[PDB]
Amino acid sequence: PSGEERCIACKLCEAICPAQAITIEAEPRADGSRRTTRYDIDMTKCIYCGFCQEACPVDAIVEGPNFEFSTETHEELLYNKEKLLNNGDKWEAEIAANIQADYLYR
Amino acid sequence: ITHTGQVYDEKDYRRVRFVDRQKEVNENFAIDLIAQQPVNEVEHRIIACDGGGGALGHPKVYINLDKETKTGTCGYCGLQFKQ
Amino acid sequence: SGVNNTKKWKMEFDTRERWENPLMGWASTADPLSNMVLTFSAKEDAIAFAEKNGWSYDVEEKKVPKPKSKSYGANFSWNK
């Protein structure tokens, strides 16, 4: 809520990705904190298993509700940190409601 | 430009890509957002930091705001706490 | 300090080009036998695999930690 991206680059979302989709490289941000310089989910490689949703300790990477993201070009499907963070900002209100409804179950 | 200032350059052979199509960059960069966060004053020597909301936060850690010299910063939220 | 990964012999093919990819910056490799590391229980068996498959081999002898004598009483010796 403050505005600090949740991911702290533990990189186990990369470890448990069955398809090798997520690529993460990180370095200490000047703040001294730990953040990901590059976070790239290759959606064409991704098989939408939802384990990344499962694995994240801070729950920074989530399976968002939108299913309509068909794209004219293959490159658009590859997603870097800025698209995903932008995707996160757009759907945060519903993502928060969805996680709110299902967290007791998990 | 972006968080870690990605700047495909005037001479790069990749800046070609944005031609006729915009780049994905972020407003309200996070780098400055917690810096914009007030220092959580506390009474106790040590304090917790669920991240706010328990299960919907970060693995709870206890920060030692023991020296006013330094405001403890939970490694997860980047929130400074003022003893 | 665990030693369970220093038990079985492994033979690993020589490392090859890993150029950066222009579109996403991901590492890219043109060598198929790169990620392949076969595990063999004994030095003799691994050498055999190289000979029949025709790959060149350069075996490195196992080096195991030498026995080291330790005793809690010994360091309490003011003398030394």
């Binding site: 310089t37 490159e75 | 990605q6 890509r17 | 910056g25």
Partner: peptide, 26 residues
Amino acid sequence: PTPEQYVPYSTTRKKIHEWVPPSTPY
């Protein structure tokens, strides 16, 4: 509740930096 294509790009930096030749002639 009561031109804009995302162009993908690497966000990391240069990494290996080469030695600039001295612009001073010798």
